[PDB]
Amino acid sequence: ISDIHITRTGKPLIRIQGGRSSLGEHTATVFGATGQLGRYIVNRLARQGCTVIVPYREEMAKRHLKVSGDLGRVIFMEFDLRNTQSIEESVRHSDVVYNLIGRDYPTKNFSLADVHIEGTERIVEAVAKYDVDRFIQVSTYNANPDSTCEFFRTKGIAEKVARHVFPETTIVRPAPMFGFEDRLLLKLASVTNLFTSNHMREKFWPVHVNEVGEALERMLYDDSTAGQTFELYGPRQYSMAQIAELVDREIYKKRRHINLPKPILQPLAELINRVLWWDTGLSRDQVEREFHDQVIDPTAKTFKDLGMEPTDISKWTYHYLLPYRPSTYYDLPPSTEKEMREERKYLHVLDDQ
Amino acid sequence: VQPTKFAVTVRQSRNWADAKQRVIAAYRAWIRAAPEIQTMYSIPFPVSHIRTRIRQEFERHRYVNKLNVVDVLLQQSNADFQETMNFWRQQSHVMAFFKEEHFRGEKRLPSNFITGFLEGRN
Amino acid sequence: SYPTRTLANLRKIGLKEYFRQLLYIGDTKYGELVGVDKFGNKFYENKEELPLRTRWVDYAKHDYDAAHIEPMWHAWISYQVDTPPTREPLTQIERPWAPKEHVPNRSFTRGAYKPYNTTQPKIQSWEPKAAPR
Amino acid sequence: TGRPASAVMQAPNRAEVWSRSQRPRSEAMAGPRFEQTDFDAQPRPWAAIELIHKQPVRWTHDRIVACDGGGGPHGHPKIYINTDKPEIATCNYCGLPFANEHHRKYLESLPQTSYPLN
Amino acid sequence: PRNAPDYNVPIDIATSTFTPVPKNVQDGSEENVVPAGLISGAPMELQARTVRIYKPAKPATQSGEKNTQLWRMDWDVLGKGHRWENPLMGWQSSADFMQGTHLTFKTKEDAIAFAEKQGYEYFVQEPNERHFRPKAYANNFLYSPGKLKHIRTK
Amino acid sequence: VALPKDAPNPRAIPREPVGEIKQALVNPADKYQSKADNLHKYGAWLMSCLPKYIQQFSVWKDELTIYICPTGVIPVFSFLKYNTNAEFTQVSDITAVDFPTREMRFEIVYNLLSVRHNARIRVKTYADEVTPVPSITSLYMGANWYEREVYDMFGVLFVGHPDLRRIMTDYGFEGHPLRKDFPLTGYTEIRYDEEKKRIVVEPLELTQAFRNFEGGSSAWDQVGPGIDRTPDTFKLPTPKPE
Amino acid sequence: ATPAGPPPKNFRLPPPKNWDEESESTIDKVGKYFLMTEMLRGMYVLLEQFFRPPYTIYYPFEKGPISPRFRGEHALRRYPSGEERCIACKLCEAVCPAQAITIEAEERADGSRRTTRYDIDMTKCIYCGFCQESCPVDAIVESPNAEYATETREELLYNKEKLLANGDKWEPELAAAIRADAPYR
Amino acid sequence: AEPQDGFQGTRLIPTGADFQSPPDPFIDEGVDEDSVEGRKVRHYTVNFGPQHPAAHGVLRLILELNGEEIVRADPHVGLLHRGTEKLCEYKTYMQALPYFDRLDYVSMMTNEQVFSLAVEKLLNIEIPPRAKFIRTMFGEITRILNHLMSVLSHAMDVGALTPFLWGFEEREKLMEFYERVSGARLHAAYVRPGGVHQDIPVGLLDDIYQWATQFGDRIDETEEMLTDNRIWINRLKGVGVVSAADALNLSFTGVMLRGSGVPWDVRKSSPYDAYDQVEFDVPVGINGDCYDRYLCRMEEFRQSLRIIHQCLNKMPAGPVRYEDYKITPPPRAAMKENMEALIHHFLLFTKGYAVPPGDTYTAIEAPKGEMGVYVVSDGSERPYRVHIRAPGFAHLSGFDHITRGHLLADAVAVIGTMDLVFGEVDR
Numbered sequence A: 001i002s003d004i005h006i007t008r009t010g011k012p013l014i015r016i017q018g019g020r021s022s023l024g025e026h027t028a029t030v031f032g033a034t035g036q037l038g039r040y041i042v043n044r045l046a047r048q049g050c051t052v053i054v055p056y057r058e059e060m061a062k063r064h065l066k067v068s069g070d071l072g073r074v075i076f077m078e079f080d081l082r083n084t085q086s087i088e089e090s091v092r093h094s095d096v097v098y099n100l101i102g103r104d105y106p107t108k109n110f111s112l113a114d115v116h117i118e119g120t121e122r123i124v125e126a127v128a129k130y131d132v133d134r135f136i137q138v139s140t141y142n143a144n145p146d147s148t149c150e151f152f153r154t155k156g157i158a159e160k161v162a163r164h165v166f167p168e169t170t171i172v173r174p175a176p177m178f179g180f181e182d183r184l185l186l187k188l189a190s191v192t193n194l195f196t197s198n199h200m201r202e203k204f205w206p207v208h209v210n211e212v213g214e215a216l217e218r219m220l221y222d223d224s225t226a227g228q229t230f231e232l233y234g235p236r237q238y239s240m241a242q243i244a245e246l247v248d249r250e251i252y253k254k255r256r257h258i259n260l261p262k263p264i265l266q267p268l269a270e271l272i273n274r275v276l277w278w279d280t281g282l283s284r285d286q287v288e289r290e291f292h293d294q295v296i297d298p299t300a301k302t303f304k305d306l307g308m309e310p311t312d313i314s315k316w317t318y319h320y321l322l323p324y325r326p327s328t329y330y331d332l333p334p335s336t337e338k339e340m341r342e343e344r345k346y347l348h349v350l351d352d353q
Numbered sequence B: 001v002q003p004t005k006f007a008v009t010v011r012q013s014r015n016w017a018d019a020k021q022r023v024i025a026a027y028r029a030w031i032r033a034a035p036e037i038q039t040m041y042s043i044p045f046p047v048s049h050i051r052t053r054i055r056q057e058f059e060r061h062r063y064v065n066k067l068n069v070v071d072v073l074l075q076q077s078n079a080d081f082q083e084t085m086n087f088w089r090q091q092s093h094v095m096a097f098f099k100e101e102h103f104r105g106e107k108r109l110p111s112n113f114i115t116g117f118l119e120g121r122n
Numbered sequence C: 001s002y003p004t005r006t007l008a009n010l011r012k013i014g015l016k017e018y019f020r021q022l023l024y025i026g027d028t029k030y031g032e033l034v035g036v037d038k039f040g041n042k043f044y045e046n047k048e049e050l051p052l053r054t055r056w057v058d059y060a061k062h063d064y065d066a067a068h069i070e071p072m073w074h075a076w077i078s079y080q081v082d083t084p085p086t087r088e089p090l091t092q093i094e095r096p097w098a099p100k101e102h103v104p105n106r107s108f109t110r111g112a113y114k115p116y117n118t119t120q121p122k123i124q125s126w127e128p129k130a131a132p133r
Numbered sequence D: 001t002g003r004p005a006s007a008v009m010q011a012p013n014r015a016e017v018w019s020r021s022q023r024p025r026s027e028a029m030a031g032p033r034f035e036q037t038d039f040d041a042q043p044r045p046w047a048a049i050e051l052i053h054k055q056p057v058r059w060t061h062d063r064i065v066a067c068d069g070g071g072g073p074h075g076h077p078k079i080y081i082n083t084d085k086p087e088i089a090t091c092n093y094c095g096l097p098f099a100n101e102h103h104r105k106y107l108e109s110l111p112q113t114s115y116p117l118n
Numbered sequence E: 001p002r003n004a005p006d007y008n009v010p011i012d013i014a015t016s017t018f019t020p021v022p023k024n025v026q027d028g029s030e031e032n033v034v035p036a037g038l039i040s041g042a043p044m045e046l047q048a049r050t051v052r053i054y055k056p057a058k059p060a061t062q063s064g065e066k067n068t069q070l071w072r073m074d075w076d077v078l079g080k081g082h083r084w085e086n087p088l089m090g091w092q093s094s095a096d097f098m099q100g101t102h103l104t105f106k107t108k109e110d111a112i113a114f115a116e117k118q119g120y121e122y123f124v125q126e127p128n129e130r131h132f133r134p135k136a137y138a139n140n141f142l143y144s145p146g147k148l149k150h151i152r153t154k
Numbered sequence F: 001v002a003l004p005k006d007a008p009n010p011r012a013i014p015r016e017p018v019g020e021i022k023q024a025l026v027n028p029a030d031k032y033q034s035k036a037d038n039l040h041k042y043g044a045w046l047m048s049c050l051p052k053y054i055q056q057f058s059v060w061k062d063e064l065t066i067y068i069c070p071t072g073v074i075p076v077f078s079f080l081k082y083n084t085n086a087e088f089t090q091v092s093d094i095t096a097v098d099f100p101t102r103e104m105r106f107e108i109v110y111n112l113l114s115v116r117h118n119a120r121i122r123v124k125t126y127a128d129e130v131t132p133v134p135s136i137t138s139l140y141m142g143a144n145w146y147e148r149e150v151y152d153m154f155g156v157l158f159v160g161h162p163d164l165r166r167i168m169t170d171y172g173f174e175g176h177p178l179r180k181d182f183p184l185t186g187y188t189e190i191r192y193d194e195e196k197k198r199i200v201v202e203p204l205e206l207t208q209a210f211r212n213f214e215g216g217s218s219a220w221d222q223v224g225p226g227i228d229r230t231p232d233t234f235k236l237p238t239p240k241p242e
Numbered sequence G: 001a002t003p004a005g006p007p008p009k010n011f012r013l014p015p016p017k018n019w020d021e022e023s024e025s026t027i028d029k030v031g032k033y034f035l036m037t038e039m040l041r042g043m044y045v046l047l048e049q050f051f052r053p054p055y056t057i058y059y060p061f062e063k064g065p066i067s068p069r070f071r072g073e074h075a076l077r078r079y080p081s082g083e084e085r086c087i088a089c090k091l092c093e094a095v096c097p098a099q100a101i102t103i104e105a106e107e108r109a110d111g112s113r114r115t116t117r118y119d120i121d122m123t124k125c126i127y128c129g130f131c132q133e134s135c136p137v138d139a140i141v142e143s144p145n146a147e148y149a150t151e152t153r154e155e156l157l158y159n160k161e162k163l164l165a166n167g168d169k170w171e172p173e174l175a176a177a178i179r180a181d182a183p184y185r
Numbered sequence H: 001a002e003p004q005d006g007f008q009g010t011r012l013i014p015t016g017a018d019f020q021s022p023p024d025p026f027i028d029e030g031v032d033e034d035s036v037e038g039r040k041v042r043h044y045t046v047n048f049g050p051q052h053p054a055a056h057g058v059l060r061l062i063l064e065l066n067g068e069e070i071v072r073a074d075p076h077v078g079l080l081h082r083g084t085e086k087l088c089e090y091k092t093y094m095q096a097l098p099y100f101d102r103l104d105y106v107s108m109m110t111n112e113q114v115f116s117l118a119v120e121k122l123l124n125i126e127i128p129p130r131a132k133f134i135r136t137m138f139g140e141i142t143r144i145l146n147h148l149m150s151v152l153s154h155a156m157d158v159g160a161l162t163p164f165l166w167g168f169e170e171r172e173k174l175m176e177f178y179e180r181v182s183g184a185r186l187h188a189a190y191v192r193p194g195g196v197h198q199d200i201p202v203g204l205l206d207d208i209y210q211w212a213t214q215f216g217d218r219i220d221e222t223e224e225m226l227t228d229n230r231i232w233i234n235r236l237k238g239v240g241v242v243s244a245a246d247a248l249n250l251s252f253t254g255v256m257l258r259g260s261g262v263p264w265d266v267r268k269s270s271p272y273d274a275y276d277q278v279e280f281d282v283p284v285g286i287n288g289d290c291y292d293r294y295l296c297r298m299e300e301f302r303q304s305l306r307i308i309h310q311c312l313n314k315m316p317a318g319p320v321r322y323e324d325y326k327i328t329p330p331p332r333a334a335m336k337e338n339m340e341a342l343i344h345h346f347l348l349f350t351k352g353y354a355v356p357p358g359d360t361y362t363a364i365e366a367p368k369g370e371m372g373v374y375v376v377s378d379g380s381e382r383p384y385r386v387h388i389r390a391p392g393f394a395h396l397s398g399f400d401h402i403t404r405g406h407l408l409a410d411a412v413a414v415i416g417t418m419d420l421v422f423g424e425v426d427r
């Protein structure tokens, strides 16, 4: 909000606060920018005049991010989580570095250990190598170093290594995110054959990706957010079945719920993930994620500390599900007697054409 | 409405009784139409917010005491009504009339002296 | 092409060269060698072809590109001059600043041109010096 | 940046700037845009100032000499240079050197000269 | 309230972080003036910024006076948003939509009438004129009975 | 190549040398004096037949212009449409010019064509930000879109017009771009917002500000006053001496 | 709709002919209907084209014709000495129809009047050639090069280091086109 | 006392509906019940455009349909309104000339002809004979170029696809002559106030004559495919019929005016350039339909060729540029040798020439109809106001009056018979 920013290292920035052609003077490196969250942090910096370094793995995927900025603002770098030089040279000029990189499943090239540990290691070591001012690590909700979930385990261990080498790390633990192009509402919207093993009984606090994207901007703009952990989540407790009925109440969709017990589902989950090359939405570790419930850290800062209000998901379902609404002239209600009379003032056939 | 669905031949108010009659009929049509504007343009606002915001745009010109000024302000309304009721305006033009869908939001002037000073004139 | 023309050119260039041209140009074409570019491209001429087809190029590279033609030959291939760079005196000017090798269009590659400001910042700021107390 | 010589030296022929408001290539080609970049592919023309001062002097017996740039209508507007000071006179448009034959003795006695002088 | 900036003016689509806070916005009621700024479709910012009405001075560099003959109305530069340096090419970027716009008027009252019609704030600068003094070539050679105190050199 | 064999090389034919080229100097205004007397006569007849509206008339070269009161629009154009000596049955063009130094900002210029008499006439009236002009779509169907342009681009309002809507500008566009107070690049710009999934409208910023080189206009007047060229039939007789 | 004075001699059409006044034999008239003879003629004209040589050029091996006056990408030239021809008059900046040229000049170390900045926005330029008509020293030209599509439009902001590099590259062809067209300029 | 007397509404402006007069009762030429006659019929609207051809690039015409026939046609234009008339106020006259190439972008050198003729009239100058013939020759080469686009794209919409390709080689050959005099295949900027920018090269008049010897055979084969073809005839006869009285009242010019039986060409009625020196005919139709306008356009192919041949034989020698350096740029050789020439060179490229005060409306016979410009001059070096009169703008305004009751397949034929490039319509 101020026109002067003294970075944590000490250099001053004199920003002019406008739009695309302005001077935000922040240089940013967003790791994990081609997913669903990164396009909100990238667009927010770029549309206010800041340079955003966007490391990418695939050329095609990254293309939608350049529209948000003026010439010289979105710089694309070809990077690999196992090539340190690509990481090193992506962060040498950056003021703030973000790390949004994360999978929910193991691959043939990355175990949840490789992604969340060996990448955070490789990346934060570069942040410490160049004395970058702010380093913001997006972790997960329910992150805990000793967890049966490899996702909650390996993402919880990254939080350790982040501050072991960079003590001034912001941690951001977002709840399952929702909105446009998500895997929460769009999953309930799109899939038909759905497999679970805990009766869709997950309870959590769904948060809009858009406040998460806006919140990550404000951690850059407040120097007091440096070195503490945040818990971003929505205002109301929700269960997946309660979330689904909202999707159900808007779109009127019928889906198959199979709900196979945990012993016969998890060993099978690994197999499907090991032979199908796309994200099938169920894997071994993802099923274990079903049994936990979100527990809010009481020692961690929240939206309010950033001057923000979360919104619930009920106020947004109609917006993000309206495109998925098959409504033709067929599905309309039976007509009333008043309008049936109106039809007698028209001829409904053209007998001369 | 001979050439187009909501066309009105350009007319010059004869007197203040006539001019106020037309203003009220213009306001009536707009606030009548607000449900129809909110579905076509998928406005993520209550119909009440649309109607209260339509009222503001008439509330701006409530103190005009010139009859030649009212007719141009009425013609501007009629033309805006025609391009909104025919799906000619894009959702981008319509929901850009609401001055809170800016990424800076409604708060775009500085509130007082000091807050605009610390931000460099906003 | 047509059979009379394509037959005669086989009788000239041979069946190994006939297949080379089908892979690149897509025509069977015979003409006199006019010269070689620094990039290795070869130029041929034949006054007896259809108009605008009297001059052509056989590129040196497999992944050929119209920017591989050296500049003075570029004028010849475009019918902008009639004298090839092999007899044009304007190419025999000594210019030590002149490029030594032909650099093609270098976009889409890590060598692509990057613009920058060439001038210094307008306003110099005070370098703070606190007097001793 | 920094490691290649082309990113460091202002021109292939010259290492330093030749005007006060010229940006050094070291500072122009620092920053994020010049990462993952070939600096030997970057446009780096030879500096004209070094080439013009490698030019030998035209000795002349006349007070006023005419320079058109040396290509007829392919040069610059024809101007006239006065060579009466005991220095080397240079065309304002092209920079070529002219000197009167009367100052050859003095000019040959100077230790350092702005043009080859032979 | 006596030049108080109306911090609660309703902004429009073109209002920016460079728009100043206006004091008075044409209500459409003021006597004898058309509220043209109210019906112009221009942003509110035109009613906040001051314009200068003046007769351009003759250049010191030359003796033609063609450009001193007409009154010019131009907008005053603001402390931020007029020019900044482009980070990429070093070009000069601007947020001032009025930076290249000027108006020409035949009389001062024609410019004042337009300014009030549009709701501009205006400062009028009165021309500086010469003081006539008869000049005579013959004086160059006037006779000095006493000390010369000047050696005229053509 | 099979040459036509009775079509020789047109470049091979030698050309007869051209020596000293000589061209007389002509003043192109001089060709228009022979019609200067009737153009004045026709304008004089017009303003005697419609004294209620025709304030003046000017003649430049081949062009006769008539200056009319805004309320005379329907009568004057009716006379110029349906008179047997004024059979001007086309509107060629209706446009406006802006003069902010006038109390009535806008000059409304109509250009009319008479195929019968191979003649052209220009009709000028005036308007204001609030002062409306009669529409002439009752007389010329072709004038309909022209008045939409004048309205769209200037804000002038045409009483009687059916469907006076914008013709050129975007749908929620605010302003009249041909007004001289309107800036060249406007006040707003558009872009696609990824976060909002639509095109949004923003205040205008320009990466390069527009460089206006008007200040380089000559300090000296370069055209001068011109030459008077009125017929003696429309000058006042001079009083002979004695 | 007709000019004043006497109507044109026989401007009015003849009276229309009845069907049985027409001069076309039933045999000719009925045959042309059922045999579709005029459509047969047009199909025959396409057979004539079939056996004619095509107009096609194999690009990029064969190029189309370009004149010495062609207006392609800009270049900054030198003298035979090696000095830049440009002396920073800024005439090409004043005449630019699209304000595509930005020039900053000062005194060089040796006292010569030379540019420090020379930028051409290749995405503002209209390729009119005005910049090169206004030059007093032939410093700015437009080469015959039309093949330089790029990937990013940042590559289309030519700075003085690229425009000089272009002139060094294209000088023989630039000097040749100038040599051809100079008499007409 | 406007606007003061208008504050209280004491005066009402006399609208045309006030002066309406009842028709004469004597010589005047030509309900609710249980029946279905009183019943109303619903209409549906249709969004037509953009079609594949380049000329109709930005057309969003919304039709109301009763079954198949068109009830009312509402074109929405402005999709290529780029603010040319405003940008022209911030440029010198020479700088504003390239804006005219981009109005009707298939007829470039005649767009810049009407701007040059307008500026030359305010300059009070007479341009030399050679440039007069150069301009009338390249104005007819331009007319052939436009008609090759207009006629062949019209038949490509109607579904004949082969004449389009044949005549675009003829178009491909005639753009080599543009690129030899200038260096542009499309936007020459060649015609300028005071004549032409540069003299034609020394072998061009031979190359145009070689093209001339065979161009009629191209018209004849294009005519082999369309003129007598019954499918072509049955898709243009009776389509888009406008009466002579209505074409005038609708602001129609050109073949839209001429196809309804009105003999009128700006070249014959207000001669400009070397048109009074050339013999040519004017094709005028009978039935005012698309078939007449197709037959009138083909006849102009043969008439423009007949002018180009006459221009080749009367090409005089001498300057191609007005011989006055306060108006036209001096030769490069003079500017590099003579003091006065460099001064006049310098001031023409920075300030520009001053045009004397006044206004002129100037029209030419453009290939798409009458094209005119209204230029207000303030006596300075930049135009105070430039207004372009585009023939297609008036033609599209009369599309509703002409397509009313027709089928949509009929309306696509009416779009092509009106020579429509939307950069012309939106300026």
Ligand SMILES: NC(=O)C1=CN([C@@H]2O[C@H](COP(=O)(O)OP(=O)(O)OC[C@H]3O[C@@H](n4cnc5c(N)ncnc54)[C@H](OP(=O)(O)O)[C@@H]3O)[C@@H](O)[C@H]2O)C=CC1
Pocket: A031, A032, A033, A034, A035, A036, A037, A038, A057, A058, A061, A080, A081, A100, A101, A102, A103, A104, A110, A115, A138, A139, A140, A141, A173, A174, A175, A176, A177, A178
């Ligand atoms: N969205 C949610 O519901 C929640 C998500 N989070 C975490 O927030 C972060 C961002 O969320 P979201 O946008 O949904 O994530 P996505 O899965 O949509 O995107 C993750 C990003 O990480 C990159 N990435 C993943 N694995 C690797 C790897 N091995 N090497 C390099 N890059 C890799 C991806 O690039 P590529 O596309 O090329 O793989 C992509 O840009 C993630 O860490 C996520 O786990 C936390 C809690 C809830």
Ligand SMILES: *P(=O)(O)OCC(C)(C)[C@H](O)C(=O)NCCC(=O)NCCSC(=O)CCCCCCCCCCCCC
Pocket: B019, B020, B023, B024, B026, B030, B037, B054, B057, B058, B059, B061, B062, B063, B064, B065, B070, B073, B074, B076, B077, B080, B084, B094, B097
């Ligand atoms: P009451 O008697 O207290 O008040 C009645 C009026 C208001 C008539 C006053 O008595 C009065 O005389 N006031 C002055 C006359 C007047 O109001 N003039 C202006 C009338 S027209 C007008 O105000 C138009 C406003 C804008 C029209 C459009 C509004 C909606 C557009 C956006 C909709 C949402 C997006 C699509």
Ligand code: SF4
Pocket: G085, G086, G087, G088, G089, G090, G091, G092, G093, G103, G134, G135, G136, G137, G138, G139, G140
């Ligand atoms: S290139 Fe020519 S016109 Fe442009 S600044 Fe240099 S000398 Fe002047």
Ligand code: SF4
Pocket: G092, G095, G096, G097, G098, G099, G100, G101, G120, G124, G125, G126, G127, G128, G129, G130, G131, G132
């Ligand atoms: S060719 Fe391009 S750079 Fe040169 S003057 Fe024209 S627009 Fe400007």
Ligand SMILES: [Zn+2]
Pocket: D067, D068, D069, D070, D076, D091, D092, D093, D094, D095, D096
């Ligand atoms: Zn010189």
